[PDB]
Amino acid sequence: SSQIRQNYSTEVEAAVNRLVNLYLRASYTYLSLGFYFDRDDVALEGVCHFFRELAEEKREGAERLLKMQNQRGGRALFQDLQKPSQDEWGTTPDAMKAAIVLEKSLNQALLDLAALGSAQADPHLCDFLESHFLDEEVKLIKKMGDHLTNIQRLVGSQAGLGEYLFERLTLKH
Amino acid sequence: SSQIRQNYSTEVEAAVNRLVNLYLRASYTYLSLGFYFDRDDVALEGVCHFFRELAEEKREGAERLLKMQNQRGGRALFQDLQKPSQDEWGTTPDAMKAAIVLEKSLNQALLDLAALGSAQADPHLCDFLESHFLDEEVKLIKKMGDHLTNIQRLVGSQAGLGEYLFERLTLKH
Amino acid sequence: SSQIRQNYSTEVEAAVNRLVNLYLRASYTYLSLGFYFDRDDVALEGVCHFFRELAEEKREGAERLLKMQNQRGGRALFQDLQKPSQDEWGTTPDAMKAAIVLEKSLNQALLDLAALGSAQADPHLCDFLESHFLDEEVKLIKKMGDHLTNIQRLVGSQAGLGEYLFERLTLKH
Amino acid sequence: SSQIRQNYSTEVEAAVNRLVNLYLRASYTYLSLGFYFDRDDVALEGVCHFFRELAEEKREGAERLLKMQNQRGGRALFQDLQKPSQDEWGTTPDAMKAAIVLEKSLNQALLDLAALGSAQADPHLCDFLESHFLDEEVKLIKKMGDHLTNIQRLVGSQAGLGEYLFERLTLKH
């Protein structure tokens, strides 16, 4: 039951639950990406840390959504978290490309929820999504695109050398 | 006169004045609630302080609206502030329920103004309302619902004991 | 490939992957438990925080296992994370009982891995499991049993009052 | 003579003496590796320091074993320290490979002693070996494998450039 629910549609409530699942799935994907780069036969620790920090960010996104669900008087419903799409993630550009695909899919889900909010005349969604979700997503995707461009520039020259240099000189330690 | 008014409809200007009256009326209601709980035959000071702090918040809301009215080149018009709906506010759950009804009515007024802003293509209202009003309202109502649930849980067990414990252990001192 | 794997059986490698899945599933279960207690019609925030902190601990356990998997030259393989067993978790004693069942199942999995390590003459597992896993589990289960005993003592007297008092006076804020 | 020896087999006592010799031999090998990289016609100082620090670690391991030998009432017996297997150590990947072979041989000796401890029902060996020896060895070998993977990635691109970059950007100064 809820004594507080007001102007909160069943459609939005369901979309929010779906988005929680998407963020948690993304977090899981990033966990797998991070540990792949920590393999002794891959050993690019800056990439390990980059993806692990993304896993944390996506889990935090999911938690923000769940907190909002309860604030509005909606009810969290969890579904299975499907395993990541790959067991091994190939080269650094392969992984960065996969990350961008993943982020674009999350962004589209956010765009769809924003549209739904407008269609349902639910202006709280405007405050909720605009900064911590939509703006963060635009910023993250820009950073990922920038990273992809740098690694592509580097591996065009020499692949092994390029991947090492990117990990040492772009990624944080 | 105004040398600055731009894209600010008479409808929005009027709605803003009405909302000022609603916030001030809410502030007045909370003043009465607070002092009721300070009666020597009620004597639940945590509840006194909870409602007095709400009275302050609602007055602050009204002042934010009036500042915005002037920023846009609209003109503040004040009306009588109707006395609160009750002279005595019953039990703690009675009062918390009354507070929630009051807050839901303010929230609906905010929702109506947000809708009007969209209908009038007045995007400044989006920035203005989203955080200090719509988000604050969602957060406040969640807190009130949580409080009501706790006091209901307690007075289901034993009323006197329950009201005392809630005031001592949930409410701030 | 691995250039480092030594004395690390395929059986242990598989068991470790299974245990990662179990820890992540437990983390997910605790996420659901925590948010259930944050519902406006439940509103027991000490219980919210207790389970959320457990969710963090279980995720940390999974990450420790994955780090060890790579240290040994094994290969992480992720599977679907099955949704928690319930959508709503009943009373505080209901939830604490469910937590204990969950923890006992993790503990049994740890016991099985310890046995396997001994059977495979893999003494690194002795150092790895003993403190951060086996000892932490014993300590956690003792705390949970203590909590269950306290809430049972309280709800035997008066249920609503008992659950409120436990949340206020035992659980951390 | 000893007035303290209890549950300490002659087999374990002998194995411990052998392991002291193995650690000291490893320390000696690392001394030679370090100074090879300090040759003016090699001049990779990060590699000098990496191997010198390993020489220190192995000597410390030997000293820990000797302290334990006396704590148990066993008697240290020293044998000749055979000279390292090479006078010159080739390329950085050549040396890193040689280090890994060396470490795997020490690890196997530790595994054998752990097995012997279990066979002799000598549980003090469990506490003694688990962290400072078995866990340290797993961690060290992971680091070495990671290093080998990075240098292999680099020298696959361009050997001279690769060895220089690894020394400058991976190894500590």
From Swiss-Prot, chains A, B, C, D:
Signal sequence extent: none
GO terms classed as biological process: intracellular iron ion homeostasis; iron ion transport
Modification type N-acetylserine: residues: 1
Residues given in the record as Fe cation binding sites: 53, 56-57, 60, 63
Keyword Cytoplasm appears in the UniProt entry: yes
Cystine crosslinks: none
Record's miscellaneous remark: In horse spleen the light chain is the major chain.
Identification of the protein by name: Ferritin light chain
Source organism: Equus caballus (Horse)
Lineage of the organism: Eukaryota, Metazoa, Chordata, Craniata, Vertebrata
Name of the encoding gene: FTL
